[PDB]
């Protein structure tokens, strides 16, 4: 039982975009084109851009879910470790077990799937401004990749799906994510291997 991670631009030409933030030590969130991999700090703003060729209709929703990248771990539900789960870092909206939160959107909705037990977070799709090319969603990852009893150094993917009001799939994309203390150094380090 594993959610699909297959790229699907769909009829609205759905793509993801990311800020070009570089690898200086001060960066809180940085994306690697070569690795298709986001490096970000704990609970910090992670901007993920939604790019479309044509505007999805009103009622369109945007969902985010994490799964383990490695096949021998893919059936295991990605959740926070007990320490962070039990931490006093609640925004009053997100369930304490959920890795992925959305910041700055009061219409955010969280799901524990009654059948697969997987966690996800969904928001209404907003079109970009007229003078803008994309819609930005501010995600927070609430556990480190290294958390013992949590992800425990196992790599994860974030899957972003576009769905209609009735939950039908409209588009899908994904990126790898590492939650760490120094995203710039870790990104630069992982890329020197190339
Ligand atoms: Zn943790």
CA atoms within 13 A on the CB side of 53: 7
Phi, psi of 54 (to 5 degrees): -145, 150
Q: Total domain count for the chain?
A: 1
84 is in an annotated binding site: yes
Residue 57 DSSP SS3: coil
Query: Domain range for residue 32?
Result: 1-194
Strand order in the sheet with 109-112: 29-32, 37-40, 169-179, 156-163, 61-68, 119-124, 109-112
**Cβ neighbours of 175 (radius 10 Å):** 17
Dihedral sign, CA of 9, 136, 122, 26? positive
**How far apart, in whole angstroms, are the C-alpha atoms of residue 139 and residue 154?**
20
Residue 107 to residues 66, 74, 100, 136, Cα–Cα distance (Å): 20, 29, 15, 15
143 is in an annotated binding site: yes
Residue 42 DSSP SS3: coil
From the CA of 48, how far away is ligand 1's center (Å)? Answer: 22
From the CA of 166, how far away is ligand 1's center (Å)? Answer: 33
From the CA of 131, how far away is ligand 1's center (Å)? Answer: 39
From the CA of 65, how far away is ligand 1's center (Å)? Answer: 17
| H runs (alpha helix) in the chain | 82-85, 183-192
From the CA of 110, how far away is ligand 1's center (Å)? Answer: 19
Strand residue runs (E) in the chain: 15-17, 29-32, 37-40, 46-51, 61-68, 100-102, 109-112, 119-124, 135-141, 156-163, 169-179
From the CA of 99, how far away is ligand 1's center (Å)? Answer: 9
Residues across the chain: 194
For residue 91, what are the contacts with CB-CB under 8 A and spacing of at least 6?
101, 103
CATH code where residue 136 lies: 2.60.40.720
Q: What is the DSSP-derived secondary structure letter of residue 8?
A: B
String of b and e for 52-89 (b: at least 16 CB within 10 Å)? beeebeeebbbbbbbbbbeeeeeeebbbbbeebbeeee
């Amino acid at each position: 039982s594993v959610p699909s991670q297959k790229t699907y631009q769909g009829s609205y030409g759905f793509r993801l975009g990311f800020l070009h933030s570089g690898t200086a030590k001060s960066v809180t969130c940085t994306y690697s084109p070569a690795l298709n991999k986001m490096f970000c700090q704990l609970a910090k703003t992670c901007p993920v851009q939604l790019w479309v060729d044509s505007t999805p209709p009103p009622g369109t929703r945007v969902r985010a879910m994490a799964i383990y990248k490695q096949s021998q771990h893919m059936t295991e539900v990605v959740r926070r470790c007990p320490h962070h789960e039990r931490c006093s870092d609640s925004d009053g909206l997100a369930p304490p077990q959920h890795l992925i939160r959305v910041e700055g959107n009061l219409r955010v909705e969280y799901l524990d799937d009654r059948n697969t037990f997987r966690h996800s977070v969904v928001v209404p799709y907003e079109p970009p401004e007229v003078g803008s090319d994309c819609t930005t969603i501010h995600y927070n990852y609430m556990c480190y990749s290294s958390c013992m009893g949590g992800m425990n150094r196992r790599p994860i993917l974030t899957i972003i799906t576009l769905e209609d009001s009735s939950g039908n799939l409209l588009g899908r994309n994904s990126f790898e994510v590492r939650v760490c203390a120094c995203p710039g150094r870790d990104r630069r380090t992982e890329e020197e291997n190339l």
